[PDB]
Structures are given as C-alpha cells and as structure tokens.
Design a protein around this ligand. Structure first.
Ligand SMILES: CC(=O)N[C@@H]1[C@@H](O)[C@H](O)[C@@H](CO)O[C@H]1O
Ligand SMILES: CC(=O)N[C@@H]1[C@@H](O)[C@H](O)[C@@H](CO)O[C@H]1O
Ligand SMILES: *[C@@H]1O[C@H](CO)[C@@H](O)[C@H](O)[C@H]1NC(C)=O
Lengths: 32, 248, 409
C-alpha cells in the first residue's frame, strides 16, 4: 500500500483541529 | 459541479486533479487513498469512442489544490505516475460498468494540512452508509452548468433507490454503480458534471468521524436535469479488486 | 407495368434518334444506373456553379440536379441532330454507355425507383414532374406513351395559343395537388404566355428525418453571420455526438449528418470564417467533393446547425442556355422530332427543403454521458453560409444540393 491507511478520513483543518465545516452537519443530519 | 458552492480550505485533502502531460490540461478528478495511490475513474484514462487511451506518462496529477489555475506555492504538489491500473472487466462498451481505476504515484507524496487520504469503505461502512436518502459529498472543478469554476466546487447529494435510478435512464444500470441526486419533488438541487469524473463521493461517519469514499464520479445524462441523476461507481463493491492490485 | 421490376427489353424503348460522338462498383447495384448517376453528379457541380453565380451571395439555394437531369432526359427522347448533340454534351451524358444512352430515360426511372425507395423508408420525399405543350398540336403518342411508364405521366396539352392563363395556373394547380400542397406558384404568373409552346415542370420537396433525433430542449437563438458581415437572429439546433467529419485543406469543415437508414445522408460544407463560401463555390469539382466524402472519419462533435426551410423555384431555361443547350430553347434552330415546329419555351424547377430536429432516438448513445473531460471533441458551429448536399451513400448520387446563406427568421 502506501502509508496513512491508519490516519485517513480525518481532515487536518477539521476533524483534527476539532472543527466542522459549513455543510458537514447537513450530511450527518441525514442519517436519521 | 452544478449548483455546488466554493469549497473551504482543506475541506477535501484527498481532492486531486488529473492533467495531461502535454498539451497539458485538466481532464478529471481523483482522490488520494494513500501517500502513493490515487483512485480515479476508468474512462478518465480509457474510453475508445472518444479515442482516449492515456497511460502512465501521458499525464500527471496536481494534489492538494484549492483554487484551479493560480499556482499555490508551498501548498500544491505535482507528481507523475509510475503505473496505471484500469479494471480488468471494465465494460466501457455497454454502460461504463466498473468505471474504476487507480494509479500509483511515481514518488510518494507528502501529507500536510492540504494533502491527506480519504479512507476506503468496508462492508460495514458500506452497509451502514450506502443507503437511499443518506447524503454524500461530491467535489470537483468541472463545468458549472450543462463555464469552469475558480476554486474546488462542492455539493452534497442524497442517494437514490435502485429502481428510481434505473428508471431515470434507458441505460442498463449495474450493481456496481449507484446514483445520487435530488428528486424533482425535493425542491433543492445540484449534481456533478463534466470534468468532475474521477472525483470522490465521500461520506463522513457518525461513529469514528472519518471520511469514506463510497463512489466515484462516473457518468450521467446531462447535468442537474430534473428526473435524472448522476451515477457514481460503487467503490466498495470494487474493493476486492482495488485491494488485489495494491497488495502486489 | 412495373418499371422498378421492368427490363429494357420487356418494354418499348426505341426513341427516334441517336447520338454517338468519339474506380469500383457498389454491391447490389446495376452498372448502368451507376454510370448514369456518376453523370448527374458531374452535371450537378457545374450547374450549381453557374446557378450561384446568378443568385446573390446572400440568397440561400436549394435544388435537385438529379430531378432536372431525368427531366431533360425526357426531351432527349425526342431531340435530334444538333439539339441532341447538345443535351448529351451539356448534361454530361456524352460519356456514358451505348445501351445506357439510348435508354437513358429508362435508367433514370430505375435510378429514381431506387432513390425514392431509400429516401422514403424514413423521410418524406415527394415530387411532381411533368411536361406541357399546347392542345393546338398532336404529340408522338408513343413518346406520350413512354412517359406514362418511364416518367410517371404522359405529356400534357394545354391551350397556350389562344389563351395562357387558365393554363399557367392549371399546372400550378396540378403540382399543388400532387405535392400535397407543399409546392405552389411553380410557374410565376406572366411567364407562360400565348407564345410559350413547350414547358418542363419539375418540383420536389424533401424533409429528412435525422438519424440522431435533434432534441428541442437544446434549440435556441443565436447570431448568424451573413456574407455582408451583418448579424441575424436564427433558430439554432444543437447536439453532441459521433458523426463522420473531417477538417480538410484550406481549413474548411466537412460534416455528414445521416438520416434514419444511412442510405441517405446530408453533407454540410462549412468554410473557414475567412474563406468566403463564394470561394469554395467557384471552386467545386465532383472529384474535390468525392475527396472530402473520402477523408471522412468518425468523430465526437458538438454540432450547431440552423433550423430552416428553403423554397427555391426558378427557370432553368436561362441558366442551361449559357452552358450550351441553345437549340432546345430556340423556335428557329430546334429539333424535337421525337414528338411540326417545336421547342422549349421555359423549364421550371422548384425544390423545397425543410430542416429541423427529429420529426428517431438512439439507445446505446451513452458515449456522451461519460463525465470526464474530452479534449478531442470538435465543434461544428454552422452560423455562416455553408453548402448542403443530400446524397445516397453507396452510389454517392447527388439527389439535392444547396447553400444556406440566410436561415435566420
Ligand atoms: C485500446 C486497448 O484496448 N488497448 C491498448 C493496448 O493494446 C496498447 O498496448 C497500449 C499503447 O497505447 O494502449 C492501450
Ligand atoms: C410518330 C412516331 O411513331 N414516332 C417515333 C418513331 O419514329 C420511333 O421509330 C419509335 C421508337 O420505337 O417511337 C415513336
Ligand atoms: C413514402 O412515399 C409514399 C408516396 O410517395 C407515401 O404514402 C409515404 O407516406 C412515404 N413515407 C414517408 C413520408 O415516411
């Protein structure tokens, strides 16, 4: 493979800095 | 992307644009699944009808870019490809079935706040997330309407029930492709378009809060037409193959 | 008797006079019918040439050279020493086969038999051709009996001598009736007087039904750039697709849109923005065109093409004359033995082209649904005068031809 399979799916400027983006909520608010 | 909106900085690390060596010019989207593997759409590289048969060194990729044309010094990174890998049973003849293809960077990229891979799904995440009504997130620098944008466009779209997809078009749909889009009765709209192909259709997880690339901007009749939807290759449905090229 | 299933021997062919001065063949095709067609395509070009030299650059044109040829092939049935040495010299028949010559008319019937078949399985083809003379005469009556078979209708006598009003409109009445009303004023008023002794009348109407159903939702207005640089609002059709196209020398585009069936296409010559059509016009040869139709390759195009309709009616009389063809039109130096004193006053042609979206749809046209970018897609934006050729593919016969110099509404 490569490297980072462990770290993937986490944005350095969001998930990792405890931040959610403009429309992000809208998605999560749809799995209900 | 039709009816989208300007993406934020670092909102889609994995977003990778795929150019052509020379005469050098954009021609698809792609994701970044590891520091050295880029996942793109089959016919972005190989489509006999348009007589497009690209290869390892006919093209390159520009990673972690947010605008589109301005050169973002210290932010973006160019990289060539060491090898292309089109699916073996990519039925481009009837219905762009199995429209997947990954490419191995020649030299491992360097992660930063702008570069980062988007997790591939797994049976659980797939089962858990690939459901009608659930929304995903398409992203790209493709045409804005059925001209081109200035910065990575982004749009969120609900997934559609198998039937409805199959009924929106005359083409033979496959279990290796799903469709995302708003119905005409949901009022709101949007959809991927031309040049968005190869792009990633991602979904955040309510559990481990990670981003999973569920599909890939493949085809669609027109752009953002009412009663018609975009079609994305089913990334997970093709993981087995995806896996069995990286492991070797 | 059935002409399409008829044989030269099977029916009376003998005309009355005869003339005789000094690469591959298409499958399932008669060699003579071939030779004859190849001829009309030779006649066509030239006749268009002089024709466009008359009509003003901005006047768009549309005519059926074949429709003409067949008709003057009817006078040849009765055309003798000199008058004859002309028809044969002008209409390029002076190079064809012997048996073919003597029965030229016949073969035109067998040729058309073939064309009106391929042209009607899909689109609306319809024409009304007939010859007229004064009741103050009596015609061969063998000739007027062959016309019955080889030209659909026996010659027709009308009072031209005493009066010529109920006549010059009894025709415009006929044609109308025959061409389902789509053709009128075939013969302008005050053109067929008391001295008009013989007149050729050949109309036609054709509305091709595309093979790619043009879809209305994409049609919109755009500017059309005429010859005199002026703009103009036209109804512009549009579609993406795979069509045989080529960007030949001098940078002019050649595009071929086929109709449902492939037996009949429509070739569009769109000259470069600078190279005025006039240039390509006053520089046409059945070999250059055959060369274009040669270099055509399947391609991906974005097509822009005006939706229009053309009504072209006129006297061939004047035009033909200056290409030779002088006697047939003179009362003095004529020779219509195949039928007393007899010549042709005026010959009339009236073509009617109709262009617009699907009046069929594909299913395996997903080729454009692919969402990657395509740097090989080439645009054919027809919004400047361009030539038009309607042809039968295997034989490359030139059924129609014209110029769209002003399609705007
Ligand atoms: C069109 C196709 O299916 N495969 C071709 C392959 O035969 C050739 O070795 C290579 C070089 O361009 O390109 C791809
Ligand atoms: C009045 C008359 O009979 N005219 C001609 C005749 O001269 C010619 O021999 C024949 C062809 O077989 O057609 C008729
Ligand atoms: C073919 O022609 C005949 C008479 O010329 C007519 O009955 C028929 O409608 C035509 N077919 C078309 C326009 O499809």
């Amino acid at each position: 493979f490569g490297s980072g399979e462990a770290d993937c799916g986490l944005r350095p400027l969001f998930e990792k800095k405890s931040l959610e983006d403009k429309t992000e909520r809208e998605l999560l608010e749809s799995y209900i | 992307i039709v009816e989208g909106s300007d993406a934020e900085i670092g909102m889609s690390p994995w977003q990778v644009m795929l150019f052509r060596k020379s005469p050098q010019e954009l021609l698809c989207g792609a994701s970044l699944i590891s520091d050295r593997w880029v996942l793109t759409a089959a016919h972005c590289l190989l489509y006999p009808p348009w007589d497009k048969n690209f290869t390892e060194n006919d093209l390159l990729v520009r990673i972690g870019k947010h605008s589109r044309t301005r050169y973002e010094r210290n932010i973006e990174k160019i990289s060539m490809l060491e090898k292309i890998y089109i699916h073996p049973r990519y039925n481009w003849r009837e219905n762009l079935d199995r429209d997947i293809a990954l490419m191995k960077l020649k030299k491992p990229v360097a992660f930063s706040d702008y570069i980062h891979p988007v997790c591939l799904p797994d049976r659980e995440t797939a089962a858990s997330l690939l459901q009608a009504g659930y929304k995903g997130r398409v992203t790209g620098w493709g045409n804005l309407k059925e001209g081109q944008p200035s910065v990575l466009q982004v749009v969120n779209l609900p997934i559609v029930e198998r039937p409805v997809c199959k009924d929106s078009t005359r083409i033979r749909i496959t279990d290796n492709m799903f469709c995302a889009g708003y119905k005409p009765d949901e009022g709101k709209r949007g959809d991927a378009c031309e040049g968005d192909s190869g792009g990633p259709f991602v979904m955040k997880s309510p559990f481990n809060n990670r981003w999973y690339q569920m599909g890939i901007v493949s085809w669609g009749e027109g752009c953002d037409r009412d009663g018609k939807y975009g079609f994305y290759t089913h990334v997970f449905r093709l993981k087995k193959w995806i896996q069995k090229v990286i492991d070797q | 008797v059935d002409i399409c299933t008829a044989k030269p021997r099977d029916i009376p062919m003998n005309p009355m006079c005869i003339y005789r001065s000094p690469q591959k063949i298409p499958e399932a095709t008669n060699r003579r019918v071939w030779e004859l067609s190849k001829a009309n395509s030779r006649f066509a070009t030239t006749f268009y040439q002089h024709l466009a030299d008359s009509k003003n650059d901005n006047d768009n044109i549309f005519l059926s050279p074949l429709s003409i040829s067949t008709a003057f092939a009817m006078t040849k049935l009765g055309a003798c020493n000199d008058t004859l040495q002309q028809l044969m010299e002008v209409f390029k028949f002076d190079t064809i086969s012997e048996k073919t010559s003597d029965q030229i008319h016949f073969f035109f019937a067998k040729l058309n038999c073939r064309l009106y078949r391929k042209a009607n399985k899909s689109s609306k083809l319809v024409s009304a051709n007939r010859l007229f003379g004064d009741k103050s005469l009596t015609f061969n009556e063998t000739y007027q009996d062959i016309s019955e078979l080889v030209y659909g209708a026996k010659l027709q006598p009308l009072d031209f001598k005493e009066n010529a009003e109920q006549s010059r409109a009894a025709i415009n009445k006929w044609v109308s009736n025959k061409t389902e009303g789509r053709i009128t004023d075939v013969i302008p008023s005050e053109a067929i007087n008391e001295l008009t002794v013989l007149v050729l009348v050949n109309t036609i109407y054709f509305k091709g039904l595309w093979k790619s159903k043009f879809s209305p939702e994409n049609t919109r207005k755009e500017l059309f750039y005429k010859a005199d640089g002026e703009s103009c609002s036209a109804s512009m059709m549009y579609q993406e697709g795979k069509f045989r196209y080529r960007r030949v020398a001098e940078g002019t585009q050649v595009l071929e849109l086929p109709f449902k069936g492939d037996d009949i296409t429509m070739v569009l010559i769109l000259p470069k923005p600078e190279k005025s059509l006039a240039k390509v016009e006053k520089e046409l040869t059945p070999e250059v065109l055959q060369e274009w139709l040669d270099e055509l390759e399947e391609m991906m195009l974005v097509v822009h093409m005006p939706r229009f309709r053309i009504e072209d009616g006129f006297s061939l009389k004047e035009q033909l004359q200056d290409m030779g063809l002088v006697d047939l039109f003179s009362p003095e130096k004529s020779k219509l033995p195949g039928i007393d004193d007899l010549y042709v006053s005026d010959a009339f042609h009236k073509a009617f082209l109709e262009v617009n979206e699907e009046g069929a749809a594909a299913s395996t046209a997903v080729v454009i649904a692919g969402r990657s970018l395509n740097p090989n897609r080439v645009t054919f934006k027809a919004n400047r005068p361009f030539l038009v050729f309607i042809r039968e593919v295997p034989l490359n016969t030139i059924i129609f031809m014209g110029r769209v110099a002003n399609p705007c509404v």
